[PDB]
Structure 1
Amino acid sequence: GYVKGRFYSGIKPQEYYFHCMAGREGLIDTAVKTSRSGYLQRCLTKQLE
């Protein structure tokens, strides 16, 4: 998966497929990120009100 191609000249189909793998690894991490810090701040602000 070492892409020697550049976006100016376009990338080959093998290295097009690996670059779609790196494009989905960030989008799946947002998909596991539903509700994280909304209840941490509520617990602090109720005591420290």
Structure 2
Amino acid sequence: FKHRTLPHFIKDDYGPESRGFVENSYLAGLTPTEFFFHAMGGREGLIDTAVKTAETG
């Protein structure tokens, strides 16, 4: 967003929880805002593998 990561924070928040630090464990479950950032990381990690095969072959 503009000066935000999600519409649930106030502008120019640089704290740890507001920019991706997931402080729970997979046994205690994640909160929604952490679920979303986790999805982002997973998505980029998923695209790189799709590229690598064709390139190396």
Q: Could you say which TM-score interval applies, normalised by the shorter chain?
A: 0.5 to 0.7
TM-score by length of 1: 0.63
The higher-RCO structure (CA 8 Å, 6+ apart) is: 1
Counterpart CA distance in 1 for 2:45 and 2:26 is 20
1:5 Cα deviation after fit:
1.1
TM-score by length of 2: 0.56
Greater helix fraction, Structure 1 or Structure 2: 1
Instruction: Provide the alpha-carbon RMSD of the alignment.
Output: 1.4
Size of the alignment, in residue pairs?
38
1:6 to 21, 25, 46: 25
Q: Which runs of 4+ in 1 moved over 3 A?
A: none
Larger Rg: 1
Please give the residue correspondences for 1:1-40 in structure 2 after superposition, counting only pairs within 5 Å.
1-38=20-57
Q: Which runs of 5+ in 1 are unaligned?
A: 39-49
